[PDB]
Amino acid sequence: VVRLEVPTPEEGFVNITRKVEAALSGHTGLVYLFVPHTTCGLTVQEGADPTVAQDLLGRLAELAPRHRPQDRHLEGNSHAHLKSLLTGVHLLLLAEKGRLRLGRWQQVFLAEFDGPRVREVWVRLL
Amino acid sequence: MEGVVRLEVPTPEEGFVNITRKVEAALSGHTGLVYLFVPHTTCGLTVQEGADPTVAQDLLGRLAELAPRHRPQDRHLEGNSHAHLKSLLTGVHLLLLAEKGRLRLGRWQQVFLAEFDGPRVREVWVRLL
Amino acid sequence: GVVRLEVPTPEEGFVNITRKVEAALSGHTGLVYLFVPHTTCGLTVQEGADPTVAQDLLGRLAELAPRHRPQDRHLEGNSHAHLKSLLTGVHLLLLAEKGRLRLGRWQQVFLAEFDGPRVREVWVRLL
């Protein structure tokens, strides 16, 4: 497995498409991605129009508000745990000659919900 | 594409399209894991129940409440942010077991292309491992 | 070609199946596929050692997917569970090294039950 280091903001979708492809070495086949974290996730979504990620983050904040009196996990990041579960922490994608095989408007994002930090993303070719 | 089958699936404005048989038809009797992917950002892939039509009905109804089309705060002018969210929540890929061309699923499971912004003709890629 | 785990579950909760999966690996190294042949439970990787994380996850999911929704047409009444299942997902792909699942120090593998109590199956396959 190849380990990528990805600095992240307090909250946001970090495009890691190029960093991943940089670890493919001309690979044509499947690519496994995994984040060994519980308060961030991985997703494939549109990046071309920056307002898409804006609305995704905004809407997720409404489904998973930071403020919840009933929360028992007082450290305060239960909202991030929920966002991570909803998004997912692993991906499996296809690549062609070192490039991720994605749709017209797709980019690979490390969705940070509890940063800022330097997150790790594991990459494995198969 | 080489080694990857491209299925093209017609979809309604919104709904769960059962693509179980169409995926199986692309397996050529394969035995092993099967990878599925939609190269789209406003639809998804999920494994759910089709036997009772109301399951899909309630899923779409509830997803609309979680991701309403109408949101003044949206910055994405095109107006489909709701579909982008439903897609993110559902997921855009699946990995399933197949035996001699048939998907191995639970008694109440079917493979669905979850359309949130149609009607369209979506693509679904199939890769045999 | 797959190993089946029989996992007991409560009415609802995150059942840690990390050790059960590893026992079935018998020292295997490589990618491992997990799948639940069910539509009202799911599979996810989350923090386990702290009981409050799972509690808040279940609490918030119940708020996002209420059990009693007037508009529901699925009379059986478990559409909330079907939704939670769809939102969580029903399969996982994880790396294993010498029989141990490669995970972050605070991650555990969970069968997320939303409509128990019952016994769920988890299919395991070595790639």
User: What is the CATH classification number for the domain harbouring A73?
Assistant: 2.60.120.460
CA–CA distance, C25 with B21 (Å, rounded to integer):
32
**Shortest Cα–Cα distance, A85 to chain C (Å):** 6
Q: What is the DSSP string of B89-112?
A: HH-SEEEEEEETTEE---TT-EEE
Pairing, β C118-126 against β A107-112: unpaired
Q: Which chains touch C (3 or more CB pairs under 8 A)?
A: A, B
Nearest Cα residue to B35 out of B84, B118, B83, B103: B103
Whole-Å CA distances, C84 to A37, B35, B37, C65, C81: 21, 23, 21, 7, 5
**Shortest Cα–Cα distance, A37 to chain B (Å):** 18
* Residue A64: alpha-carbon gap to chain centroid: 17
Helix (H) or strand (E) holding B113, with range, is: strand B110-115
Method of determination used here: X-ray
Nearest Cα residue to C114 out of C11, C5, C7, C36: C11
Q: What is the DSSP string of C24-45?
A: HHTT--EEEEEE---SSEEEEE
CA Rg, chain C, in Å? 15
Between the two ends of chain C, the Cα-to-Cα distance in Å is 10
Nearest Cα residue to B67 out of B47, B46, B80, B86: B86
Nearest Cα residue to C7 out of C100, C94, C119, C106: C119
* Residue A8: alpha-carbon gap to chain centroid: 10
CB C7 within 8 A of CB C122: yes
Secondary structure of B22-70 in HEC code, one letter for each residue: HHHHCCCCCCEEEEEECCCCCEEEEEECCCCHHHHHHHHHHHHHHCCCC
Judged by CB atoms closer than 8 Å, whether chains meet at B48 and C33 is answered as no
In this structure, the number of other CB atoms found within 10 A of the CB of residue B100 comes to 8
Total domains present in chain C: 1
**Shortest Cα–Cα distance, C83 to chain A (Å):** 11
Judged by CB atoms closer than 8 Å, whether chains meet at A73 and C55 is answered as yes
Pairing, β A29-34 against β A118-125: antiparallel
Judged by CB atoms closer than 8 Å, whether chains meet at C53 and A64 is answered as no
Mutation target for C interface from A81, A119, A121, A125: give the one with most C CBs within 10 A. A81
Q: Which chains touch B (3 or more CB pairs under 8 A)?
A: A, C
Minimum Cα–Cα distance from B69: chain A residue: A59
Q: What is the DSSP string of A84-126?
A: HHHH-SEEEEEEETTEE---TT-EEEEEESS-SSEEEEEEEE-
| β-sheet bridge partners, residue B95 | B35
| β-sheet bridge partners, residue B114 | B16, B44
- DSSP label at residue C93: E
Q: What is the DSSP string of A4-60?
A: EEEE--SSEEEE-HHHHHTTSTT--EEEEEE---SSEEEEEE--SSHHHHHHHHHHH
CA–CA distance, A60 with A82 (Å, rounded to integer):
10
CA–CA distance, C78 with A36 (Å, rounded to integer):
32
In this structure, the number of other CB atoms found within 10 A of the CB of residue A124 comes to 18
CB B105 within 8 A of CB B2: no
CA–CA distance, B112 with C30 (Å, rounded to integer):
29
Which candidate from C95, C104, C106 shows the least CB-CB separation from A1? C95
Contacts of A33 in chain C (CB under 8 A): none
Helix (H) or strand (E) holding A78, with range, is: helix A78-87
Q: Give the domain range for residue A53.
A: 1-126
Judged by CB atoms closer than 8 Å, whether chains meet at C95 and A34 is answered as yes
CA–CA distance, C114 with C57 (Å, rounded to integer):
12
A46 part of contact set with chain B, CB < 8 Å: yes
